[PDB]
Amino acid sequence: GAMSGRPLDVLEESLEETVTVRLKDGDEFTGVLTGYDQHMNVVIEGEDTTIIRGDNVVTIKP
Amino acid sequence: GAMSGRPLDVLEESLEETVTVRLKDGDEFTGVLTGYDQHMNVVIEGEDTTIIRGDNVVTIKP
Amino acid sequence: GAMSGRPLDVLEESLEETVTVRLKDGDEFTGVLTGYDQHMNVVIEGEDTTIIRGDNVVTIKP
Amino acid sequence: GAMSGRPLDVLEESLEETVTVRLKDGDEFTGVLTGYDQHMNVVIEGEDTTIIRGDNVVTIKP
Amino acid sequence: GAMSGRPLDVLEESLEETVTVRLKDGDEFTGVLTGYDQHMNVVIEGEDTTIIRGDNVVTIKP
Amino acid sequence: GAMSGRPLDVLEESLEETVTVRLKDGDEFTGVLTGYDQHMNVVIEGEDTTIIRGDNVVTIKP
Amino acid sequence: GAMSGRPLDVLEESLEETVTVRLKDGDEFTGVLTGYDQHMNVVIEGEDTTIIRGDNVVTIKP
Numbered sequence: 001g002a003m004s005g006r007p008l009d010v011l012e013e014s015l016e017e018t019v020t021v022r023l024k025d026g027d028e029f030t031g032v033l034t035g036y037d038q039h040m041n042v043v044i045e046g047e048d049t050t051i052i053r054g055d056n057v058v059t060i061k062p
Numbered sequence: 063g064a065m066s067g068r069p070l071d072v073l074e075e076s077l078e079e080t081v082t083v084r085l086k087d088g089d090e091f092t093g094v095l096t097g098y099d100q101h102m103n104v105v106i107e108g109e110d111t112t113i114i115r116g117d118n119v120v121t122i123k124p
Numbered sequence: 125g126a127m128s129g130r131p132l133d134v135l136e137e138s139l140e141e142t143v144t145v146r147l148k149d150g151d152e153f154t155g156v157l158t159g160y161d162q163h164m165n166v167v168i169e170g171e172d173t174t175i176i177r178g179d180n181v182v183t184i185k186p
Numbered sequence: 187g188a189m190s191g192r193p194l195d196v197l198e199e200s201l202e203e204t205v206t207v208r209l210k211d212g213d214e215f216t217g218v219l220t221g222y223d224q225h226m227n228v229v230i231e232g233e234d235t236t237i238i239r240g241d242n243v244v245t246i247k248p
Numbered sequence: 249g250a251m252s253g254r255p256l257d258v259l260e261e262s263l264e265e266t267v268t269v270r271l272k273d274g275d276e277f278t279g280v281l282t283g284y285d286q287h288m289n290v291v292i293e294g295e296d297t298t299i300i301r302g303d304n305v306v307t308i309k310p
Numbered sequence: 311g312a313m314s315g316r317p318l319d320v321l322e323e324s325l326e327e328t329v330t331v332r333l334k335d336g337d338e339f340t341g342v343l344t345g346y347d348q349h350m351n352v353v354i355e356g357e358d359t360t361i362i363r364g365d366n367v368v369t370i371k372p
Numbered sequence: 373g374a375m376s377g378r379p380l381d382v383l384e385e386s387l388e389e390t391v392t393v394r395l396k397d398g399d400e401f402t403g404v405l406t407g408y409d410q411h412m413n414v415v416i417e418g419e420d421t422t423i424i425r426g427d428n429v430v431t432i433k434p
């Protein structure tokens with residue numbers, strides 16, 4: 001198809017795996033990716049759950 | 063389905079439980095989550111009711 | 125139903141009550157909430173009338 | 187109805203009357219409001235005519 | 249009508265006339281308004297053509 | 311018609327010609343405009359090819 | 373057709389080819405373009421997979 005492996009599809013394929021999320025402020029969050037949505041909001045599970053709002057995200061290393 | 067546990071579905075299951083919202087300006091708001099919407103606007107209940115506009119949120123930890 | 129006490133619904137129930145609105149620039153406005161819209165634009169009646177563009181809002185405390 | 191006196195409805199009742207618009211960069215513009223739109227762009231007429239793009243607006247005092 | 253003299257309608261009444269556009273970075277552009285769109289992108293003609301993206305616009309003064 | 315010579319229409323008629331794009335960070339890119347889209351993403355080809363995301367654009371000079 | 377070589381179409385033609393993405397914070401990512409979407413989110417394959425959110429992108433140079 002078009003668009004190759006879409007970014008949200010790569011996120012779909014990274015469910016239940018450890019990703020690292022880097023935010024515009026410099027902070028990094030590492031933990032299991034348990035959910036995401038169309039805005040690139042992500043749920044990251046480490047010692048506890050973190051919902052990260054997508055507009056803060058610079059990169060995700062899945 | 064697709065998307066694991068969507069971020070807004072994790073909010074739904076955090077309703078009436080305690081969460082911490084961290085904003086872009088550095089402020090943190092702890093209290094009971096009593097509502098949310100599509101924009102990730104949140105209602106946090108401490109001694110006061112605090113409506114937080116979604117665009118200010120960095121992370122929500124339930 | 126879903127989303128608990130939706131943020132805008134709490135606004136609806138805060139009409140004609142005193143609220144405090146804090147802006148990104150750190151200013152605060154206290155007065156009677158006489159209107160709002162789906163952007164979280166709000167009308168605050170103090171000594172005189174203030175319309176606040178929602179995109180400046182950080183928190184609203186009803 | 188809902189939302190009380192909507193922010194855009196207050197601007198509707200302030201057409202042909204004097205208002206003060208304050209901008210995110212701190213400038214204020216005073217004059218007769220002669221038009222507006224759903225983005226809250228406004229037309230302010232004092233000695234000059236000024237179209238103000240709504241995303242710059244913090245407050246409007248009708 | 250509603251909304252008085254809508255800001256984009258003022259732009260229409262300014263086509264083929266000289267206006268002054270002030271940007272968020274402080275620069276000012278004076279020239280013939282030869283076009284605009286619904287985002288308030290404008291084409292300003294001085295000694296040459298300048299297309300200005302609307303999200304940089306603070307004010308337009310016909 | 312309305313809106314005069316629309317900005318995207320000026321971009322159409324500047325295809326295959328040389329233009330200067332100035333970004334919010336202050337950088338400038340000069341080259342032949344070989345494409346654009348509704349967001350004002352542009353493709354500029356001088357000695358190499360640069361896709362510029364429209365949200366960074368201040369002005370384009372065709 | 374209209375719009376010449378659309379920016380997203382240049383991206384399509386760059387799949388499985390090395391490109392270089394520059395971000396607003398100054399960082400640069402070089403690697404194989406393996407995916408993209410309509411927001412200009414991109415997936416860049418270097419030593420690791422990196423998902424880049426579009427709104428941080430300034431330029432992409434294939």
Ligand SMILES: O=c1ccn([C@@H]2O[C@H](CO)[C@@H](O)[C@H]2O)c(=O)[nH]1
Nearest residue numbers: 039041053054055100101102117
């Ligand atoms: O839940 C949401 C909704 C929107 N946005 C993004 O953030 C921008 C500004 O808040 C929006 O335009 C959208 O791209 C999010 O990150 N999360």
Ligand SMILES: O=c1ccn([C@@H]2O[C@H](CO)[C@@H](O)[C@H]2O)c(=O)[nH]1
Nearest residue numbers: 101103115116117162163164179
């Ligand atoms: O009530 C609202 C309406 C919009 N937004 C978000 O704020 C962004 C711009 O301020 C919008 O794109 C949207 O994501 C909110 O947070 N709350």
Ligand SMILES: O=c1ccn([C@@H]2O[C@H](CO)[C@@H](O)[C@H]2O)c(=O)[nH]1
Nearest residue numbers: 163165177178179224225226241
């Ligand atoms: O009257 C309006 C119209 C829109 N916005 C919203 O402000 C954000 C940034 O301008 C966008 O979400 C936009 O929809 C307002 O705050 N007020």
Ligand SMILES: O=c1ccn([C@@H]2O[C@H](CO)[C@@H](O)[C@H]2O)c(=O)[nH]1
Nearest residue numbers: 225227239240241286287288303
């Ligand atoms: O003519 C326009 C078009 C859009 N916007 C608003 O500007 C913000 C983005 O620049 C969004 O809230 C958008 O609705 C305006 O203020 N005026």
Ligand SMILES: O=c1ccn([C@@H]2O[C@H](CO)[C@@H](O)[C@H]2O)c(=O)[nH]1
Nearest residue numbers: 349350351363364365410411412
């Ligand atoms: O590829 C894209 C997708 C979206 N946007 C911008 O994102 C904002 C969405 O309202 C607008 O400024 C739009 O031009 C871009 O610049 N490029």
Ligand SMILES: O=c1ccn([C@@H]2O[C@H](CO)[C@@H](O)[C@H]2O)c(=O)[nH]1
Nearest residue numbers: 287289301302303348349350364
């Ligand atoms: O071609 C353009 C010019 C301006 N914008 C504005 O940039 C904002 C991005 O926040 C949008 O909401 C819109 O108002 C576009 O989307 N596209």
Ligand SMILES: O=c1ccn([C@@H]2O[C@H](CO)[C@@H](O)[C@H]2O)c(=O)[nH]1
Nearest residue numbers: 038039040411412413425426427
């Ligand atoms: O996954 C997403 C979702 C939204 N946006 C951006 O958020 C804004 C929504 O108006 C636009 O700039 C759009 O390109 C992204 O960059 N990536």
Ligand SMILES: [Ca+2]
Nearest residue numbers: 013014015017
């Ligand atoms: Ca996997």
Ligand SMILES: [Ca+2]
Nearest residue numbers: 012013014015
């Ligand atoms: Ca799978």
Ligand SMILES: [Ca+2]
Nearest residue numbers: 172173174248
């Ligand atoms: Ca009054």
Ligand SMILES: [Ca+2]
Nearest residue numbers: 187190191195
């Ligand atoms: Ca009414």
Ligand SMILES: [Ca+2]
Nearest residue numbers: 199200201203
């Ligand atoms: Ca009146």
Ligand SMILES: [Ca+2]
Nearest residue numbers: 249252253254
């Ligand atoms: Ca009329």
Ligand SMILES: [Ca+2]
Nearest residue numbers: 261262263265
């Ligand atoms: Ca005229």
Ligand SMILES: [Ca+2]
Nearest residue numbers: 265266267310
């Ligand atoms: Ca003039």
Ligand SMILES: [Ca+2]
Nearest residue numbers: 296297298372
């Ligand atoms: Ca020319």
